[PDB]
Design a protein around this ligand. Structure first.
Ligand code: A2G
Ligand code: A2G
Ligand code: A2G
Ligand code: A2G
Lengths: 8, 104
């Protein structure tokens, strides 16, 4: 639904 | 902007550094990279947007998690803070990390 960020 | 500053074009949205007056602008229809350029990322800014443009900002990278605040016109620096976000929180967009410009 939303844009996400990179994981650890 | 104040007197002498080049105005945002009608289809352009800008963030302007509070410290330096230097700007980062995009036309309607464009977004930043994963983060804003290193010289401005996370720095204190205000929005200066042309009449047809709306600036979407996030305090996080990549315009993410509905942490999105919307800004039109020439915004006072203090009005970058405590702003309604898409996700229902009120967030600080004074030091943004990512940006998109859309039609108002
Ligand atoms: C969030 O990022 C994705 C790509 O990873 C898309 O560009 C999406 O359109 C972005 N969301 C917003 C609000 O610009
Ligand atoms: C963020 O995470 C989602 C999983 O919920 C996706 O993997 C998406 O591609 C990720 N976005 C980025 C920029 O890495
Ligand atoms: C991606 O980074 C953002 C901040 O930019 C958040 O920390 C988010 O929780 C991160 N997502 C993942 C899956 O670690
Ligand atoms: C994921 O990677 C990006 C660069 O690709 C960012 O550095 C981001 O802050 C990273 N996410 C995590 C949770 O460290």
């Amino acid at each position: 639904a939303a844009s996400t960020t990179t994981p650890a | 902007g104040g007197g002498g500053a080049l105005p945002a074009k009608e289809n352009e949205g800008c963030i302007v550094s509070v410290n330096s007056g230097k700007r980062y602008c995009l036309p309607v229809g464009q977004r930043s990279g994963y983060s804003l350029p290193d010289w401005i990322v996370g720095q204190e800014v205000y929005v200066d947007s042309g009449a047809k443009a709306k600036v979407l900002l996030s305090d996080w990278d990549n315009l993410s998690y509905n942490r999105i605040g919307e800004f039109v016109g020439n915004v006072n620096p203090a009005d970058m803070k405590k702003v309604k976000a898409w996700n229902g929180q009120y967030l600080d967009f004074s030091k943004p990390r990512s940006m998109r410009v859309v039609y108002k």
